[PDB]
Design a protein around this ligand. Structure first.
Ligand SMILES: OC[C@H]1O[C@H](O[C@H]2[C@H](O)[C@@H](O)[C@@H](O[C@H]3[C@H](O)[C@@H](O)[C@@H](O[C@H]4[C@H](O)[C@@H](O)[C@@H](O[C@H]5[C@H](O)[C@@H](O)[C@@H](O)O[C@@H]5CO)O[C@@H]4CO)O[C@@H]3CO)O[C@@H]2CO)[C@H](O)[C@@H](O)[C@@H]1O
Ligand SMILES: OC[C@H]1O[C@H](O[C@H]2[C@H](O)[C@@H](O)[C@@H](O[C@H]3[C@H](O)[C@@H](O)[C@@H](O[C@H]4[C@H](O)[C@@H](O)[C@@H](O)O[C@@H]4CO)O[C@@H]3CO)O[C@@H]2CO)[C@H](O)[C@@H](O)[C@@H]1O
Lengths: 13, 508, 496
């Protein structure tokens, strides 16, 4: 899923 | 995924005749042996699209035709494939309701419209006009009664009056650009409703339960409801009539016409069994009679059983109000229109917003999908290869997004590698975006970064010779954006706020 | 900020004497009766908004005080001596008085004296009575089947409790006594002696229009029957299997928002204006409160045969716990009753899932929190579940180390809110589409992995909040599936 952790776009697996 | 085989799970709204539909299930299990589960989950129209996308959910989903456009767009519905014989068995207008992108996506059941329901004993001659109800309430209040009580909490019931003097969701040509929620006819309609409430002829907090209670206990002379409600009034032993809705400013009330439709999950391994149940067991005189006997469907799509029940003064008046009203669009952003207007009506009814402020923000909400898609899709196709706000937004997106891509290249490349995008089948997992705002925070930084990564992937799609799958990516980003953050977006003056956020950073 | 200064906003349920309470307001100088106010208050109060004063039965206030949404009340010993000690015990959480007690409320059997000169002493004889009265186009009994407040007396009769004095582990909803109670109710409905869809409005209408011979209701309802001028009696609730009907005893309580800048003004209103003979008389004149907490005005109104019978049913019933889990008990049992009354579930299935529902949150928190603190550094089910979690979860951690480390390095934690955010993300990551025990253990196993990191990075304080947050999203998003699997008992059987 594409996700926002603190103004950082993250692919979290 | 987890949809069980050799059985059928059916979802229908609890206001419909689910116990009648389960009796049809019993007959089917008698004949074919196949177990039929009829459930009435709360918020099922919101649940279905969530579960179905993850491959779970019911075999068959029952809702009004307006929801099915969004579902079919997301690929969550099996394309139905009926005989021309079967299509000739039902009304053509019912099929046009069910049709999206030239594909039949569900089975039409019955045509629904709100009518004026009145206590014959309290009100032998119900009023022809909205404008005379305040005078009627004065008279009835002296007898410890009220003229009119209906569900103010749902925009389905408030819309007849809003659409009367001038009001449309999206104009037919459907022009998703032309939305008619903040025009002066809608203003008049909703201002009339808010006046009834300020003059204590109605109360803001009246819902479905409170209105049904009052009418069936004989405390109110009129209610606005559909065929589904007739059974509970039939039990109440109140002499009730069903008639034309009151005219506003000499124009008739325009209720939205709903078509109860049955769709099949694209993820159902019982697609065959489903077709059988709906075609040969439901949508037969004996079958529709079971459901209608529990809760009336109105004027059924099946021409035969419609011919039988046409005689009902109740159905005659349901169809009378339909001729005066307009059929709901099934386009996917009907959802957003409904959510927006729901809030408009409730905020004005409560006085949290003025009618002008309330209707204005609901206009913004409805228009957000079209405009979002326009801006995002243009940027994405530009990067891979009209409107004042759009032009400035795209200008801003060019400068800022090209910047976010440039600065985040190494992180963006890492993520593209992990997505493993090398074809169109691999592209068809866009439930990635679903949870982008999981931590619950929204800011323009995030939204630009999301679109900037959308652009990064659109460039890869051109590389991978999948130029056509750019618009679907753009559509998916637009979907999550407007679906989850409509209120925040409207609250920020929409795309005009976006341009001012990045105008400021640039120049200061 | 959010809350108004120099004004008092009061929330009281619409079934109570709000117009009486507003007359007290007039003397002092905003009384609202919002729908679902008991659900709204905890939501708005946490965002610093809401009313100055919230009125509900004492059962809701424990959850509120646990969440810090209530001001500690500060009465004179004089004032405490003015009210009954049993009313203060009701309004006490963690040895702190969290609201002002008003009046003691209990369901009694209300009967039409003209239709029924001598009402039945037993539940078991009502089906025969309905046959007799049905011939006259009447009915024996109609009450609110939609709320478990009214259905519980019969359920608790042969065996049934919410708690043991409170042991949050010992819940009595799966009993053969409860089975009998609810099976009796479901039989009345199947035999058409009652209807599944009967609610408060329908039952009050029927009794007051003279169509039914009996109803079950509280003091609040007397005013609307007084208007109906049906000759009505108030009496003991029918016995079931020779055991008395055990209605839950509620204490109408007034609490103050911890976010109210008018905490002083609030105390004044309740102490010197409301809880006075003159003051209670205003509210009671609109809608009767029952036996008021103020001993003086109770002494005056004690004479009422109606209040005498309300207190008679109270002695036979049990006072409601104010513990925070009461809400989940209520929600679970509400569904049990309605699903059995409808026939959507059998009484066994319905009562079984209501037992699971009540205990799910407390049990989840106990198991998950212990595992998390243990890794860093309902009891029988908990013990076996924690035993299972130890073997399995240490295994999931070992096998998922690479993925768990990647995610930990991405999702670095600073505060209670980042711990909350982590939770909302984890359910989505680990539960891609499907709910199964593998995924739920993997989620808890990652919670453990992070709890271990919190010790490493000298943030040992963030462990309890993480446990709380994981429990929150676990029960919120998978409640139905968890209850459907017989909760934590199913977890232990899955891994045997
Ligand atoms: O959408 C489906 C469903 O929704 C609706 O029901 C919801 C209600 O609107 C809502 O108020 C909620 O009520 C809960 C309540 O939140 C909870 O505290 C508990 O209520 C207890 C009281 O705590 C307790 O005091 C007692 O209440 C007495 C009170 O003491 C007495 O003084 C007098 O006021 O009578 C009251 C009894 O009504 O008992 C109740 C429990 O019986 O539990 C409540 C749930 O039972 O619950 C609903 C959320 O699902 C619609 O109303 C419903 O028809 C729809 O199907
Ligand atoms: O928190 C948000 C609240 O809104 C949620 O409901 C949404 C639905 O998800 C949308 O579909 C839409 O509902 C439309 C509906 O699509 C449309 O067909 C029509 O539904 C009629 C229906 O034809 C008829 O058969 C009968 O049941 O009346 C229905 C109206 O009650 O009209 C709807 C708009 O009123 O928008 C709604 C909300 O407006 C959610 O379910 C709520 O529970 C929630 O509180």
């Amino acid at each position: 899923y594409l996700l926002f952790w603190r103004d950082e776009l993250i692919l979290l697996x | 995924g987890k949809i069980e085989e050799g059985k059928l799970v059916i979802w229908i709204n609890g206001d419909k005749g689910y116990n009648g539909l389960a009796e049809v299930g019993k007959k089917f299990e008698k004949d074919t042996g196949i177990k039929v589960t009829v459930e009435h989950p709360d918020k099922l129209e919101e649940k279905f699209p969530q579960v179905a996308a993850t491959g779970d959910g019911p075999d068959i989903i029952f809702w009004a035709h307006d929801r099915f456009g969004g579902y079919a767009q997301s690929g969550l519905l099996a394309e139905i494939t009926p005989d021309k014989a079967f299509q000739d068995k039902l009304y053509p207008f019912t099929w046009d309701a069910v049709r999206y992108n030239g594909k039949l996506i569900a089975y039409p059941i019955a045509v629904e419209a709100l009518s004026l329901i009145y206590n014959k004993d309290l009100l032998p001659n119900p009023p022809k006009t909205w404008e005379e109800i305040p005078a009627l309430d004065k008279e009835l209040k002296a007898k410890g009664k009220s003229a009119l009580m209906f569900n103010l909490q749902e925009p389905y019931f408030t819309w007849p009056l809003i659409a009367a003097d001038g009001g449309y969701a999206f104009k037919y040509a459907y022009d998703i650009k032309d939305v008619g929620v903040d025009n002066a006819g809608a203003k008049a309609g909703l201002t009339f409703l808010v006046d009834l409430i300020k003059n204590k002829h109605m109360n803001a907090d009246t819902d479905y339960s409170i209105a049904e209670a009052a009418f069936n206990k004989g405390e109110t002379a009129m209610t606005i409801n559909g065929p589904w409600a007739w059974s509970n009034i039939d039990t109440s032993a109140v002499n009730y009539g069903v008639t034309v809705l009151p005219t506003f400013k000499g124009q008739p009330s325009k209720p939205f016409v709903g078509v109860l439709s049955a769709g099949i999950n694209a993820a159902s391994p019982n697609k065959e069994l489903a077709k059988e149940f709906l075609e040969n067991y439901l949508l037969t005189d004996e079958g529709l009679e079971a459901v209608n006997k529990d809760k009336p469907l109105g004027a059924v799509a099946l021409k035969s059983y419609e011919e039988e029940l046409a005689k009902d003064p109740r159905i005659a008046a349901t169809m009378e109000n339909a001729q005066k009203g307009e059929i709901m669009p099934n386009i996917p952003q009907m959802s957003a229109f409904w959510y927006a207007v729901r809030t408009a009506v409730i905020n004005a009814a409560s006085g949290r917003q003025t009618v002008d402020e309330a209707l204005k923000d609901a206009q913004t909400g409805s228009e957000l999908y079209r405009q979002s898609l326009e801006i995002i899709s243009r940027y994405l196709r530009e990067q891979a290869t009209s409107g004042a706000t759009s032009r400035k937004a795209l200008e801003t997106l060019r400068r800022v997004g090209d910047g976010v891509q440039r600065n985040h290249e190494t992180a963006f490349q890492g993520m593209l590698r992990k997505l493993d995008i090398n074809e169109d089948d691999v592209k068809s997992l866009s439930r990635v975006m679903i949870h982008v705002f999981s931590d619950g925070v929204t800011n323009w930084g995030r939204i630009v970064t999301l679109i900037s990564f959308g652009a990064f992937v659109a460039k890869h799609l051109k590389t991978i010779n999948q130029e056509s799958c750019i618009e679907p990516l753009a559509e998916s980003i637009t979907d999550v954006l407007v679906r989850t953050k409509r209120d925040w977006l409207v609250k920020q003056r929409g795309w005009d706020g976006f341009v001012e956020f990045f105008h400021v950073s640039e120049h200061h």
